[PDB]
Amino acid sequence: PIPLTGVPVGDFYVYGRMTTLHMGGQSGIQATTLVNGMIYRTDHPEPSTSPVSNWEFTVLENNTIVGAGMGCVWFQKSEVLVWTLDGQKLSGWNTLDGVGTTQLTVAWRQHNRTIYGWANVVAWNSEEWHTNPTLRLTYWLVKINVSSEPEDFDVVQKFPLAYLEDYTTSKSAIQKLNFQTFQKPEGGGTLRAQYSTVPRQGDFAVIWQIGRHNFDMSTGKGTPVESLSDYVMPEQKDARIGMWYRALTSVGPRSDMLTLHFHFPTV
Amino acid sequence: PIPLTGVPVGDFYVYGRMTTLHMGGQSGIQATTLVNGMIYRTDHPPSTSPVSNWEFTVLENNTIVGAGMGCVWFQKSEVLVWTLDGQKLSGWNTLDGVGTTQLTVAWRQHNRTIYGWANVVAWNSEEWHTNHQPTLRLTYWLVKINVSSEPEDFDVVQKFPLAYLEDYTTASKSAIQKLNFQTFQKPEGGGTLRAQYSTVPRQGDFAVIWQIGRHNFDMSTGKGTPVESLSDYVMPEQKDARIGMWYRALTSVGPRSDMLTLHFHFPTV
């Protein structure tokens, strides 16, 4: 047997149980199915000097927004395997304990307080899908610097789904070529973000954003996504990053064995 | 560097690119987003050999010991295979020459049910509580394809997973029901939807067929019960799954293919 020793050198895979941050719910009811709630707040009580994207997380370089975070899954370095490849041969069975982070920071807007310097970007990956900047799905591996306990709160939440036109609950006219993202309320015109579990300092999380934005795979920087709507995808897509179905699922469990591939800075 | 040597000994993990069989579509329009198309055909035929209400049917001896509602396929070369010892790599193996079981998958195409299409190799199942009725279970089988059949695109009733929406509005809001798992019909124009089979597997390749809904399964024999129908579901507790299949099996939309990881179990003694 090969023990999980060493630190991943170069691009590396991370496979293990990853837990969704908050569940789409309503006060009193345990939210168990709505896995992809994306908090979308345009109101900016943030001082103009300290900016934050229209979403929950905001990737920043030096006070400048270089990305956004709509979804968040988190894990612990003790529950995940890490391996790096030589083509398709195993070149490392390593652990994240002692991984190096970048200067890039992630800011977490929580209900009524935003935690600047919540995490430091470690590695990333991204992929585009042309819709006619084009639509991209970018995610970041981040190392968590602080330990915060978020507060459940009702907020408007956009979800991924299909473009239906004659909806019934048990048949609806489905549009192909079409990705749709829209808000979904329960009770108020918003939806409760039920933070079931929560990571801590030293843990790891994988935040991501999907939609029209630009990204640069060597610097880890890009642009935040402003808004989400309908998207017409003309041709097919055979993706390689390994998280499109998780980022497009409407309903799922809280956690599941998910695999991810991450790329280090290569300026 | 460690090479891909040997066949997986024991329960193994398969990571790689997995391409779906057919995309939910319509004549004229290329089907690029409808990734979770589950063909539901209650019309059964030639009655001499059984068939399930879905596209694929796992049969031990003409008994329907399972059913296949979704399908992703790949070739043995585009996957990583590794078995574990807790957290230490027991083997960096390949599917080349892996052993199959006597369980057989039959594929009901448009007007052609190809029997002995695949032989089951391994399996995994995960249940999620829903309330002599079976619990909701997700069961997928790793199968070794024995033919190179070229299927035929055709329009039928197609089951699709999604949330429970109530006051729908698009172009866009809909009262969303938490705790709720809805699986309904997704046709276009008429009453059915076309299955656009594009990249189709060949002999010697592998596929992952899975079923979701009310059914029972045995992780020791690989035999279970087929899923009759799909409706609404209420999941009072949360699920922290461990099979790595729920998000791909429950997404309403997604790319034709992507990288997935799956844990499989061999026959138990």
Numbering used by the authors:
A (entry chain B): 408 to 539, 546 to 582, 585 to 682
B (entry chain A): 408 to 452, 454 to 539, 544 to 583, 585 to 682
Paper quotes:
The HAstV capsid precursor protein comprises several domains, including a highly basic amino terminus that binds to the RNA genome, a core domain that forms the icosahedral shell, a spike domain that forms dimeric protrusions, and an acidic domain with unknown function at the carboxy terminus. The HAstV-VA1 spike forms a dimer and shares a core beta-barrel structure with other astrovirus capsid spikes but is otherwise strikingly different, suggesting that HAstV-VA1 may utilize a different cell receptor, and an infection competition assay supports this hypothesis. The HAstV-VA1 spike structural domain forms a homodimer, with each protomer encompassing residues 408–684.
In a different approach, we generated a larger construct encoding the C-terminal residues 394–758 of the HAstV-VA1neuro capsid protein (~43 kD), and expressed this protein in Sf9 insect cells. Mass spectrometry analysis revealed a mass of 36,020 Daltons, similar to a predicted tryptic fragment of 35,970 Daltons that would be generated by cleavage after arginine 697. Following removal of the sf-GFP, the HAstV-VA1neuro capsid spike protein was crystallized and diffraction data to a resolution of 2.73 Å was collected. Finally, to evaluate if there are structural changes in the spike that drive infection of the CNS, we aligned the HAstV-VA1gastro and HAstV-VA1neuro spike structures, which resulted in an RMSD of 0.78 Å and TM-score of 0.97, revealing that no major structural differences are observed. Statistical analyses confirm that there is a significant decrease in antibody binding to the HAstV-VA1neuro spike compared to the HAstV-VA1gastro spike. Thus, these data reveal that mutations present in the HAstV-VA1neuro spike protein result in reduced anti-HAstV-VA1gastro polyclonal antibody binding.
